[PDB]
Amino acid sequence: YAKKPHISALNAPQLDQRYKNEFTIGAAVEPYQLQNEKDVQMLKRHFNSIVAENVMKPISIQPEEGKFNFEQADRIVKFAKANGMDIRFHTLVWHSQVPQWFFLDKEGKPMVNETDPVKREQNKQLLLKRLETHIKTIVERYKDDIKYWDVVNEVVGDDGKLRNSPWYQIAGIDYIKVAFQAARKYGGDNIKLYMNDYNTEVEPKRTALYNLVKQLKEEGVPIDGIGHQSHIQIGWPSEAEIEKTINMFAALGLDNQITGLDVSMYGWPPRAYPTYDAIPKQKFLDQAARYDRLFKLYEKLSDKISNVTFWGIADNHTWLDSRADVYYDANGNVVVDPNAPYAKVEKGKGKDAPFVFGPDYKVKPAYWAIIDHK
Ligand SMILES: O[C@@H]1[C@@H](O)[C@H](O[C@@H]2CO[C@H](F)[C@H](O)[C@H]2O)OC[C@H]1O
Ligand SMILES: O[C@@H]1[C@@H](O)[C@H](O[C@@H]2CO[C@H](F)[C@H](O)[C@H]2O)OC[C@H]1O
Ligand SMILES: [Cl-]
Ligand SMILES: [Cl-]
Ligand SMILES: [Zn+2]
Ligand SMILES: [Zn+2]
Ligand SMILES: [Zn+2]
């Protein structure tokens, strides 16, 4: 409701306690935020699950072969343990924020360039060996502290084919199989292994993901759940399509986690307002009604969803701002209409507002829409 006041989130009813029998409530964080008093208070008050926005990605953990940097990841793990939070590991394998040394052959040349079939096969086995050592080292360190693992991220293309990353060009589908088998072998039966992706609701990617995981499980590849990034909009994807997607994977015996939820104010490609102040009130009411519907649906499906994680804490910090392109007409006025004329765009200079907490750490209408029982 819009009657409900814009109070400090540190005085508001706890979000994780509202949902504690339905699913955990998580947030993606940076270590610097554990030094910010407000962010610490926000995490202590409202969240019971945590994930690293960046410092557990492949390039952050092993930027050079043999050089492991766990310092930053350790800080997130320590904070979680001290506050009784679940931890998700994001992420063991990804085609982005991944060090290039992985994909160089013995002479330092890119493996993708290799044409000889015998050398190509040698490169596959070398890559798969490096992959296993990366996973082994990380999981040997964290298997007792981190329950949920994004083993692979974004391995299915939006075209419904496997994404043709260097991982896939060099090693084929086996890099996916090796990643899960290695995590299971070094982590044991008690860690939960996930395949994570965006637009899991969208054909042809959805059923390609479905076929992939169904085939892998049939071959004995250990995979326990699907991570739905859920980088969504006020109107897309539809709740019915979210519901159908989540039932589809639950029918395979898979857990579902909402791993990166944000509800952007904009379309795609976004035409953003240049500042938070410029976003009209009505956008916040539209977002709150979207959030109201969305969490009612998560509650409906709470037996198939173990965790809902936001990709951030409060509106003062969201990766969505890097997509918030501001369009200007010939008179220098801002253009937010997705079809209107415009002369220039300022990429990533605008402001999105995706969470239930505003940038001054006060509750948004979206918060009241999901803290109630209506
Ligand atoms: O790099 C990925 C990025 O491409 C993805 O953005 C989606 C692209 O497809 C549609 F346009 C959606 O609206 C976008 O959200 O977000 C995840 C990121 O890893
Ligand atoms: O800070 C940014 C970070 O938030 C972003 O994280 C990705 C967001 O899209 C999906 F959720 C991916 O799985 C996340 O890893 O990555 C880019 C970084 O600059
Ligand atoms: Cl209950
Ligand atoms: Cl960011
Ligand atoms: Zn309940
Ligand atoms: Zn709590
Ligand atoms: Zn301002």
Ligand SMILES: [Zn+2]
């Ligand atoms: Zn549940």
Ligand SMILES: [Zn+2]
């Ligand atoms: Zn960030």
Ligand SMILES: [Zn+2]
């Ligand atoms: Zn509600």
